[PDB]
Structure 1
């Protein structure tokens, strides 16, 4: 649950992402894959990537980064009223991709890391607080659907 002022911070930060969605999406996935190499094994189309240089050179990884952040941005713009947008993603990630909630924690922290890396000194403590709360809400509502499905 976020206040109006917190949502305003989230959507202000998101403007930074929308200026370069592919570059942000690429770096988020690279941070996930290099920090948590077990996550790469869930992607049949990226498991061939052995080095970060190959990851950086992969145009399909940048494409998928655009898909991921476009979906997340659509959810964030609903300011919590995201049941219709979130349900299909919860279902596909639990039942088809088999993504444990832990990996959603990993990618949430990766987003925070990338924002500081690309905007050092321009991602203030209030903005980090609000973005963190928004990603916690996203993860918590996914977790509720995971529990319904019995997925661990």
Structure 2
């Protein structure tokens, strides 16, 4: 999992993201749907047109959960426990889809905050998204 250096780095990038977490949430989803159209299948009941209220509302929630995990980096399985049941037990999201979303998020960060995403911070943020990925696909039995 995450070293003290990694946790510093992740707190570092998320501080810069700050007030924009909601917009970045929406932007990450829009890029995921466009770049990996197979993800659209998990949202059949969504309006997936660009800048739809449904994407913005959902994006805000995804970003909010990421912020919450950052604020509880030492125990993310606890911070995201309710979300693991939803993603692993109920929705049964294929693990591969968490890699697509993690990658689109890193793309969004790079666009808006290129100077903050140094190679070192990149490596830490990737580990973090991987850690979140594994928690949300956990309780599979």
Give the drift of 1:132: 0.8
Match of 2:50 among 55, 58, 65: 55
State TM-score, norm by structure 1: 0.83
Give the drift of 1:106: 0.8
Give the drift of 1:22: 1.9
Per the alignment, in what secondary structure is the counterpart of residue 55 of structure 1? Answer: coil
The answer for the alignment partner of 2:66 in structure 1 is 72
Name the Cα RMSD after superposition: 1.7
Unaligned runs of 5+ in 2: none
Which has more radius of gyration? 1
Give yes or no for the alignment of 1:133 onto 2:127.
yes
Unaligned runs of 5+ in 1: none
State TM-score, norm by structure 2: 0.89
Equivalenced residue count is 141
Per the alignment, in what secondary structure is the counterpart of residue 93 of structure 2? Answer: coil
Residues 33-112 of structure 1 aligned to structure 2 (within 5 Å): 33-46=33-46, 48-49=47-48, 54-56=49-51, 58-112=52-106
